[PDB]
Structure formats: structure tokens, C-alpha cells
């Protein structure tokens, strides 16, 4: 037997007598296409199928020539190919899914040693939100966007969260690969949707994480058949200026690669201040050891300076990896606490396998 | 004579039903579908179609007049999530392999210990590792070791070859990743074993054509659902290739995989077991001397040993016998093993 | 300017493409217009780009340009008789070319 | 019914008739249908390679109960390789002649077909025809291009013919270990094709082809001089003694050049000296004699 | 209706405009090389009884080479003048296209043309475009 | 080469359809040049005038240069130490001559496949002479300006055509007195003397080091 | 050519095409598969059409279309006429030799089954008397028209 979409008759039995006949002859059938361009004061819209041809047709009198832009899935007649009511991609709540507005479990002391950039992030974020007085009286426009760049996992996510719980109001994190979509012209609508619905509420913070994917990478040198990252990039630099007459909401980007750099972003009005992160000297390392040991069972008679001396060049993900590995050494035997020599092997296991 | 309303709807629809493709679902009794030629239609959907199983990626039934959704269609016998599950038992448990006991406690503490004794982790609050990489020279012990650990377990096991994830329907790739990880989540904490992951992940190149992007999105969604961080339920994943340097670096970096097990070289110790293992299921006569074959040749694997025993069986059947004499082994040792013997600095290093 | 009938100007740099046999298709298409129209002049500037010397294993991009060059050597002077057609080549580096050219 | 084609009406899309025989388009390459081209005794010298092939092909067919009595399975994979092309077609066409068995030859250059999928679909369509006639042998000719190496996809090494190599390796042993199907692959250059199909799980017989010996070179010479006109007082061994590492085909070239020398004289006779100038014509190599290339290294 | 066999797949015969237009005695100086090709190509075509008597089995093909401007194409024209075959010639770098499979299919189209037709002569000018030694196809 | 409107049944030519092209030079079209006051530049006022004498008077006095018997040049080169006003000068003068600025970066020309710059250069020079007397600025042509006759891997093949297709576009065969080129580098001697001579870029505008009096003016 | 006529949608409980006293409806067309798929018979129905033929139309259409006065007595002069009697003899001869080849052959092992499974529809009498009939009638018409004009014209 088969199914073919059946059900027992108690819900569709009354549906199947005369409602099916009214969904055939009155209800028409339309198709979807893409919109290449447009003309002024007259439609003359050019529409491609990508499978049939490119057609030059007109809209119907059901819609107004207002929201029909380049790149929108619209309804196409079978006979006259006329533009019916366009269709949106996705509805509705795609902003709340990245705007949790929730108190994060990060202590302000979780970043110790490189306090100079944290005070820079204090001045750039907190002071035009709550102390906007010296900016007016002297005569410098306050900056409203800072790029972060440097070695990966240096504390980029840590410092970006350190300002997140600092004011606790409208934190928005954007994944860099989430805007890499499949449809033609998908993120640029979402960038319009994010920017409008964040300007409604005040004291809001938006963070762009991993802008190596969409934030001005290669502008258009490898994608010569799709052109989506560039159109979104051209749209976001378009909507950032012009549509920001003296706003309040701050936008921050971070990258690993110090190459994906737009000079049009460093035009004054988009991005002005350079803040990079560097490696800890001695103490910022040892602080992270003091962070990733207090949560686990270690010996109270061991030191952390000696371990950081064995690690000249190291990041917090590496330091976290040593503690997990030295964690596993204590599990290899029947030890319910951590001894110093398990940390010493984990240094030699992590470093002296591939690094140096 | 009683069944009437179902019979009318069996007769209400059009007879030449075509087969469609769900793309997006809008809950206003109409949506957008796809034909077989990639032509897409703003059509509607009926009421009897049982709107509970409509997923973007499912197959439906369409018409010729208005091409509306006649009824939802099943998977049409597509066993791409059920066949890869090992139902029976694999090969011998731990006595099959030999001379790899350096590497046994690694995988035993990583798989069996988080399941059988999850108390060592809770005495100090330390998380178990998620992924384990098995690389080394090709055909060394990698497939033989994975079957050795999967035999000694008390949970379900998955066998994935890697080429049975790659299709061309533009959704089938990352969907079956979600369909497998849903099966692994809903069922017992299975052991994901995806062999040959170098075919899907290397060096992260993006082209403009539509032959390569179906790999990268499936790779990217795999790293997304591996690190979905919502509810994984301790699913242990074992990944293995031969080479390691031409692989994806962000799968190597911690947070993802913290176990990179290497499978080094041999010796004339581990061989003698594999000679005995391969010469067990045959009519081994009482006139054969394997010890002369062991000491003489000094570089061979078990796949070489297997090729010896098969050629020994063939030479015995060419001379119309049942049992095998030593001479068939001697010629098989001299015939088959002469295909790769090249390159040695002899008499130079004591 | 004077005594002109049909004067083609080839830049000899734009005749390469990303597809493997397309440059040879351009050359024969250039010469059939030259047989369509009687007396005609083909001016190819800068033979140094597409000319050059044959050599050994040579980074497969270069194998195409040698195949483009071998097409040019055959079509303008080969099995068929090029009649009422004159060719003006002009460059600056005649040092290393194909001596068959 | 599996792989059952049907007649469909083109107006209402209704069934019309169950169709006859299964999917086998382009069997013009298949089923060679002409049995005599060459005998057995016209090869000579390579009798070991002959006896191996005869009792790796005809012995699994004519007496399968012997192989079903020991306990091991029967071989199906044969690889032939010899760099100058010595006994690479003659030995194929001879076993194609006295076998009374179906012969299918497919060169490894035809499956490429223009656009996608079509070159892949006829792979399985061949084997279902090959299983349709269980007494059959598929011959592969020059598996060197399709079957080289799995390269990257974004750079060169386009993954289009790769699917066929995936299909070929996963059809014969991916689903079911079939029977009465023997494959023969013949190419040189055994360092550049892929090694996954070279494991002993698939191919059991890597029969090489060495250059012929002086007894072998004498026997090849007696083959081609059999139809010519020979004059008395001639030694054929010394001709083969003047071939230091010949290639079998060069015996034909000496026979043609000695024939061509006697042609221009309008003479049906041939001397020993005619062959001496014939071998010296063919022996034209870049490793020149000089007596100093090979004596400084003694 | 049924079309006649091989009404397609190329049209590459030389009959009646165009012609090579050179006599055989125009080349002065190749007393061996003109005599060598003629033994290999024209002489099998007419005097076939002489080969069969000795058992020579005339050669299948011929490689010509050397520096440019020694008389290479000029010889092939005077061959094509004094012949009674369907002379089928082809540029070397011709049958390489953008779409894969086109090249080898055009190879089949030429050979099925000449084999089904008269005892014809196939001439390829250059092959160093398409016939060097092979190595690992990295590209 | 025209994209005419065609009836779907009669196949009749009735429309013109103004014929767009690739999106890459569309991305290179930069309009709305902000008016930068020349007094922002300190110490380099001679070079400002010599530029204004070179371009603006050919834009204004079109008939003064025709009755005299001369031809205005179309090639101007800026060079010097990087950061001395190579990107502060002509885009301050593109703001008053309303003639549709059109940038051209150097390494954007280098693409992955072969024969991409030869399309991309020519189409850029196509669109400008399709337009009004526009201005083509090229920035860092040191990248594509090699030092020729050198066949050494890997920069031996992909550059020289795009170099040439530039060069044969500048003077070339037909006269190109429709669009002006103000192309600039920061390096001189690495260039080969191929387009480096007159005909092309001949107005050598050196940028000196800013003086103490120039730097104090700028601050 | 076909004409049609719409039936109302109110006759859903009664069978359409209310035929009463007629039996010509099985004639003139039956509804084919390409017709009964779109609207037949549930929307519209087919109708029969005959042709109003009469005198004062039919004979005068034939006498002005298929009629020739001066052409019925021409001679089609013998440059190409006896030339046409030569290209046909050769192909008839080869068919006769092929007809010779089969008649002398005479397979006499299971003849009636070998004859019925091996037909050619061109050898025995298909290509043998077809052209022979055509060459016979043509020269008879030509010579008789040649003899009559010699009787008439002096
Ligand atoms: N033992 C032999 N006796 C007679 N002739 C031989 C012998 N070995 C080789 N030849 C000659 O060598 C020629 C090559 O045929 P062979 O099958 O040996 O290689 P091949 O198949 O042509 O090589 P490839 O596979 O590269 O095409 C044949 O013409 C054959 O006459
Ligand atoms: N022996 C000769 N007698 C008369 N003319 C000759 C002779 N040798 C060469 N030539 C002239 O030189 C030219 C030789 O060119 P040909 O077309 O034979 O090819 P090629 O130049 O020798 O070879 P390629 O074209 O491959 O370099 C001919 O056009 C011919 O006019
Ligand atoms: N004469 C000048 N007066 C004031 N600022 C200048 C001058 N020359 C250069 N600059 C400054 O230099 C900066 C950019 O240098 P630029 O000329 O763009 O370097 P390059 O063109 O070599 O990349 C601009 O912000 C501009 O303020």
C-alpha cells in the first residue's frame, strides 16, 4: 500500500467537497524568478529564469511599484509573465535568536594583565553611552566603530564579553558564517532587519565575530558566479553611513587576519580606532592558569609561574588545553587531585609535539 | 460500499501525478515547491495532505493544471541512515591485534571509561574528550583497531565510509548529517566512526562553480553540528585518515579534537601472530614450515601475509590437491612478495 | 589610411581565455574573415607575448600558449594556400621566439 | 521488476505495455562476434604468462567445484603490464579466440561522455549486461587516464571521471561478490594509476611482461619468417644475438626492412646481410654505442 | 525512412577545390626521402601483389621530423596530388575543446570515416601539442 | 553585440535595452567625490598647479588647444615615498571637474585564471569612453608593471598581457582623446621602459619629502 | 477540423449527450485519447459535420483544377524519354540477378518456416515487376500518342 498524504476523515472530510474546486479554477499558479534591475518612472523590469531566458515584463495592478527591488522572489504569470505579489524568504523572529539579552557568566576579573585595551574598550563603549559631556564641550565626534585584530583566541571573545555584562543591555553577537547563505540576496535583507530593529531600542551593542567570512575579505576575487558576500558587504557599508544620523548603538568587528582591511571602512565615519590584542608577558599567562585550575581539583602547594615560563608563545586555548591534558594524566592513575608533574608532562606533550 | 469519502479523493485529484520537491513552507495553505527540472512554482496545498510530515527536503505529489501539492510522499525506500549501523558483531576483540598495546589505554580511557565508569571525571570535574584522530601509514592497523575497540563496547556503533554522504541533490549532504546525529542523539550514545574524512575536508577552497560548494557546506555543517553545544549526550566520534598534513586545520585545533593517535611501524614480533591468524582456517598440512618464511622476509604487512596464504591455497589447487605443502608457501613467498622491495642502506650501519 | 581594403588589428594579448580550446578557435575565425574578404591585412602587434621558444615540462598554463602558437604557425602557413593576404607583425623583443616563426 | 522499462502513453501518462529486453544501449562496442583473428602458436617464448592466464580464467570456469572444495574464493582481477608493449594484445586476442566464451572489450577512454551523469550511468548498465551472460569476460584497454589519482577539486584534477572510478571500484566489490566474471586490465606505467584498486582485495594477478630472451627472440623470428621466402645458408640465431634487449615488435621491423631491401632489387630472395642492415636500421637509440659509455663502467 | 550510413561526423575530404596544386617533381633534392614515402604510401596502393608475394606487410605509418624549412608540408602536398585516395588531413591542436569528451569523440569520428570509406590517407601535421610523455595529471 | 528586445512569437526587433555588463567595473564606479579644498595640502602647491595646468585647462579651454596646433597630453604620473599625497591629490581635483571618477586598483587586476585582466582592463576602458570625458585613475600599477623579457616563474605570463592590454589601450591604434589617465605609483625604476616613455604617462610628478615647514603647516 | 458544443453543468445526475433516436453517433469520429483528457465529455461534447455537396459547384471545380486540354496530346520529346528507359534497365538487371541468386539457392530444409521468418519484401515480386510495369505503360502511352498524331497530321 501507500500513503500519498492521507488522514482519517474527521478534519478534511468537510474540506474535500467544494473547497478543492475553489482552489483550482479561481486560484491560479505563479512561479518564482529573480530581479536583475529596474528603470525609473516606468517599470520595464528585466527578469531572468536562469533556466529559460531573460524576460522584460511588467508588474500587475495587484502590487505597487514600491518594494520591488533588485533580487526578490516575485510571482510570475504563466501567460503574460506579469509580476504578482512578491514573496519574502523567512519570517519572523531572526533577531531574538542572536539577541539573547541575557546576563553572561563572565567575571570582570576573567581577563587579567592586559588592562590597557580593556580601558580603551571602556572609553569607546561605556563613555558615549553614559558620559556624553566632554565629547560635546571640546569638539571631537565620538567614534562609533572599532576593528579588533591579531592572534586568534587572544581574548577577543573574552573582552567582547567583558563589555557585554558591563552594561547588560541589548547584546547582539553575529556569527560571521551565519551571514554566508545560499540564496541570492539573503543576508542583506537581514542586515536591513537587524539595523532597523536595533535602532528602536537604546543602549544596544552589536558585535561582528569572524568578519573574515563577510566583512570585506577578498572583496570580489574568487566568487565570480554568485556575488553574495560582496552585495551584502556593499549593503552594510551603505546602511552603516547615511542611515546613521547621530546614533547610539555601537558596532564592533573582530578578525584574526590583519589583511582583510577596507580603506573605505577606515574612511572617517565608519571605523576610526585600531585596537589589537597581544600576547601576555608573564602575568597574564599565569592569571589564566589561575583561572583554569580553581574549577578543578589541584594541589594547593603548586605554583603557576614555572608553567608559564615553559610556555613562551601561547594563547588561552592552548593554556586551557594543557589543563585538560594534565587533567587526563590524573585520571590515568587513581588520583583524585592534580600533582605538579602531571602539569609538567602536559607542557611537554602539548609544546614538544608540533610547536617547537 | 462503506468507504466513500476516501474513494472520492482518490478520484478527485489528477491521474498523472508528478513528483515534486519541498523547498520552503509558509503556513497559509500555499508554499513554494520545486519540479525535477529546477523550475519552481507558487502553488498551494490541500487540506487532507496530513500537514505533520512536511519538511523542507521531503518529496510531494504535484499536478499539471495548477501543480498544487496533491499529497506528501514518503522517502521511497532510501536507506541512508539505517544501513550504516552495525547490527552484528565485528571481528575478534583484543587478541586479534598484536603489539599495539601502547595505544589501547588511550582509546579505552576515551570511550569505555566515560561510559562504564563516569566517576573519575566527576571526582575532579574534568570533561571527557570528544574526538580522536587515528593517522599513520596506510593500512597499518587503523581499520583493525577500530573494530577491536567497537567489539568491546556496551553501546551501538556506526560504520561510515565517507563516500556514502556525498550526493548531488544540493541538500542531501548536510541533511544526512543532521539525520544521523538525530539518530545518534535519540538512540543510545553510539560511536560515530567516519572513515576517510580527507575526501571532504582539506584546505578550505571556495570556487565559483557548482561542483565544489556541495562539499564545503556539508563539511561546514558537520563542524557546526559537532559543536552545536545544545544537547549532544556524550557521542564519541572516531575519525581516521592515512595522511594528516593535507587536512582541515580547524578540526585539529582544540575545542574540537584533543586526541591525535599515531600508528607507527612494525617489527618481526607482531608478524608471527598474523601468520598464525591467517594460517588457521585452511587445511594446513603437517609438512609446512612457516618459521623459515618469517625470518627471511623482513618487510611485509598482514595484507602481504593474506596474499601469501591465498597464493599458497591457489598453488595447491592447481596441482589438484586438498592440503598445502611447504613448497606452495615457498613459491608464494617468492612470487607475491616481489612487488615493492626497493631501497635499503645495507652493511653501512651496524 | 591609404590603399586600405580590410585591415585587422590584433592586440595579441586579449586572444587568450580561461577555456582550453578557445584561443585556437579565435585564430581560425580571424583567418576565415581574411578569406571571406579579398585583399586583407592582418596586423598582429607584439608577437613576444604569444610567441616565444618551445621548451620542456613547463607549468601547464604554458602548454596552452604553445598550442595557441602552434595553431598560428599552421594556419597562416601550412597545408593551405594563403592568397591575397599579407601579415604585418610588430614587436620589440625578437631575441627569443620560435625560430619556426 | 528490477530495471524494467515500460511503454508510457505520452498524453495521459498511462501504462501501455511492459517492454522487452533490459537496458543495453551501445552494445556495438560489446560482443565482438568475430572469433578467428589469430591462433595460439604464433606467440612463442611467453609460455609462463600463457599458462598463468589459461589457468586463472579457463580453470575457474571449466572446473569451479575444485575451487569450491578447498575453501577459498575464485580470482577475478587480472592486471597485465609491460612497458614497450610486448604481448599486450596478441595474448588478449588469442584467449579471446579459443575460449568459446563471451568477450567484451572496452577501452578506458570511452566512458567520458559529454555532459555529467551519462558517462557514469552506463557503467552499471554494462555489468548488468555482463551478468546477463554469465559465461563472459570483460576486457579493459589502457586504464591509465580514467584511474590516475584522486586530486583536489578546486584546483586541477577535475572530479568528473572520478565518479566512474568510484563506480567501477564500488560495483564489482561494493555490494555483492559476483561470479563467472573475469576482468583483464592492460596498461603500462604502473606508478601513476591509483593504488586503492591495486590492493589484493580486488586484483590478484599482476602479470608483468619482460623483454624477450635470445631463445624467445629466435622463436618470434621463426614466426614472421615462416611466411616469407628464405634462401639457404642463413643463421637466424645470430640475428637474435644481434638484438641486445629487443622488444618483440622489432622482429617485425627487421622482417619488413629485409623485405623492403629485397623489393627494390626485384628479388624474391634474402641474404643474411639483409637482416644485418635491417637490425642496424632499427637499433637507432640515444644511448649510442661508442665503446666508452659502457666500458668505463665495468 | 533510414538515412545512409556515415552521412555525418565530419566532412574532411579533398576532392575538386581544394587541391594541393604541386607536381611530384617540383621538390629538387630528396632522392631518398621522396623515394622513401612513396615506397610506404603510394606503392602499397597500386602494386600490392609485390608485397603479398614476399610477405612484407607494408607499414602502417610514418614519422617525419627535423628542423623547420627542410620540406615537410611541401612533400605532403605532392603526395596528395598524385594519389587516388580520399586525403584526410587535420591540424594537431584542432580537436581540443572546452567540454570534456569532445576530443576523443572527434578522434572516433575521423577513424570511422576513413575506415568505412576508401583506402584513405590520414595526415596529422603536428602532434607535439598532444603527444608528449605523460606524468601525474595534477591539473 | 546589442541586446535588442525581441518578440516572443514574431521575433521582431523593437527595443534597445541599454546593455549593461560585468559587475566588477560596476563596483569600480565611484561617484560623489567630496570637495577637498586645495589648501589642505601644505608645501606641494607647485605640483597642484602643474596638475591643474595639465588637466583642468584641457577640460575648460577645449578650443584654445585646437587653434594653437597642439594636443593636450593624457598621461600623468605621480611617484615618491608612499604616504606623501599619492592618494590625497587628484581625488581632491576630481571634485570640481564633475567628470565621473573611476578608480583602478593594482592587485585587483591579478586574477586566478588566465586572460582575466585582459577582459577586465579593456572593459574598464570601454565603459569610460562610452561615457562623458571621464577620468581613469590607476593606483599601484607597480604590481602589474614588471621589468620585461624575463621568463621566470611564476610572474612571467599572467602580468605581461595585462600590462600590454593596458599599454595597447592607452595610445594604441585608434586615438583615445576621450578619457584622461592620471595613473600613479610609488616606485619608478622597477618599471620597464615600455609605457614609461612619452605618448603615455610623461608628466613626472615627483613627491618630495615634506619639509619642517610643510609638516608644521599640515599639523 | 472538428467543432464542439458546451453542455451545462446542471446535468450532473443525468448522463451527458442526451441521445434519443439516433445510431449515427458511433460513426464520423470516435473520441480519441488526445481528446477525452481535457474536457470531453464532462465539459463539452463533439458534433458531427457533413459536407454540403451539390451540382453547379463540384464538376466545375474538377474541370478547372484537374484538367488539361493541350497537355493530353504532347510528346515529351525523346532526349530524356529514351534516356529514362536506360537507367531503369540496369537496376532491374541487378534485381534480376539478385532474383536469380535466390531462386537458384532454394533452401530445402524446413522451407515453410524459413520462408515466413525470412521475408524481405523487396526480392521476389516487389522490385521485379514494379518498374517493369512503369516502363511498359510509359512507352505504350508515348508510342500511341505518337501514332495518333501521324494519323491526324497528314
Ligand atoms: N611473442 C611474439 N610473437 C610474435 N610477435 C610479437 C611477440 N611479441 C610481440 N610481438 C609483436 O609486437 C607487436 C605489439 O603487440 P603486443 O600485443 O605485444 O603489444 P601492444 O598491445 O601493441 O602494446 P600496447 O598495449 O602498448 O598497444 C605486435 O605487432 C606483435 O606482432
Ligand atoms: N627541396 C625543396 N625544393 C623546393 N622548395 C623547397 C624545398 N625545401 C623547402 N622548400 C620551400 O621551403 C618551404 C618548406 O616549408 P614546408 O611547408 O615544407 O614545411 P617546413 O617549414 O619544412 O616545416 P614546418 O612548416 O613544420 O616548419 C616550402 O614552402 C618550400 O617552398
Ligand atoms: N600634502 C598633504 N597634506 C595633508 N595631508 C596629507 C598630505 N599628503 C598626504 N597626506 C595624508 O596622508 C594620508 C594618506 O596618505 P596617502 O597619500 O594615501 O598614501 P598612499 O597614497 O601612498 O597610500 C591621508 O590621510 C592624508 O591626510
Coordinates of C-alpha atoms and ligand atoms in Angstrom, one line a residue, chain F residues 40-44 81-88 139 186 218, ligand 3:
Chain F
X40 CA 44.6 71.2 3.0
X41 CA 47.7 70.3 1.0
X42 CA 50.8 72.0 2.5
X43 CA 54.1 72.6 0.7
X44 CA 53.1 70.9 -2.5
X81 CA 57.7 57.9 -1.0
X82 CA 54.4 56.2 0.0
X83 CA 52.3 58.5 2.1
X84 CA 53.2 61.8 0.6
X85 CA 49.9 62.5 -1.1
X86 CA 49.6 59.9 -3.8
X87 CA 46.0 59.4 -2.5
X88 CA 45.3 62.9 -1.4
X139 CA 46.6 53.2 -8.2
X186 CA 55.2 54.8 -5.6
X218 CA 49.9 70.2 7.7
Ligands
LIG3 N1 50.1 67.3 1.5 C1 49.4 66.7 2.4 N2 48.7 67.4 3.4 C2 47.9 66.8 4.3 N3 47.8 65.5 4.4 C3 48.4 64.7 3.6 C4 49.3 65.2 2.5 N4 49.8 64.2 1.8 C5 49.3 63.1 2.4 N5 48.5 63.4 3.4 C6 47.8 62.4 4.3 O1 48.3 61.1 4.0 C7 47.2 60.2 4.3 C8 47.2 59.1 3.3 O2 48.5 59.0 2.6 P1 48.4 58.6 1.1 O3 48.9 59.7 0.2 O4 47.1 58.0 0.9 O5 49.5 57.4 0.9 P2 49.5 56.5 -0.4 O6 48.7 57.3 -1.4 O7 50.9 56.3 -0.7 O8 48.7 55.2 0.1 C9 45.9 61.0 4.2 O9 45.1 60.8 5.4 C10 46.3 62.4 4.1 O10 45.8 63.2 5.2

